[PDB]
Amino acid sequence: ARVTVQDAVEKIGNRFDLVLVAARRARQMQVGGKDPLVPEENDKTTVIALREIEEGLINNQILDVRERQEQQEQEAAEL
Template sequence: MARVTVEDAVEQIGNRFDMILVAARRARQIAVQGKDPMVEEMNDKPTVIALREIELGLVNAHTLDADERQTVREREAAEIAAVAAIAEGRSL
């Protein structure tokens, strides 16, 4: 997909500025954090995948916030388990 139209994505989010922020966050999740795309990749870059996910209503600011909160909870639980293991005198 060489060209991407963003009108549908803008309609899903509400305005183009918020759409850019949501698309950037989602693209970063896919590219850097290794999150799996919710649509077929079709050899597209993470930004195009993010826009397609937004257009389909799969991603918005609320879903990204919820996903990030879940990631933080999981990370904190792992840290607590590691500290508990150290406190008990055993290693992971």
């Protein structure tokens, strides 16, 4: 389970933007566009996003470039 989320706020500031980042990422998972960057413990899509917040491999700065790169991938779909 997620007992103390302190490791999250300890990285991303404002503690509320943490909710927006983990929420948007958890949306990227629950409605699948992506896969977890960290192994699943059987925890829900809510917790996996926070696990990604702790490891520092998912935050507001990364998801922007992810989304944009996938946009340019869809413009690259000419085939």
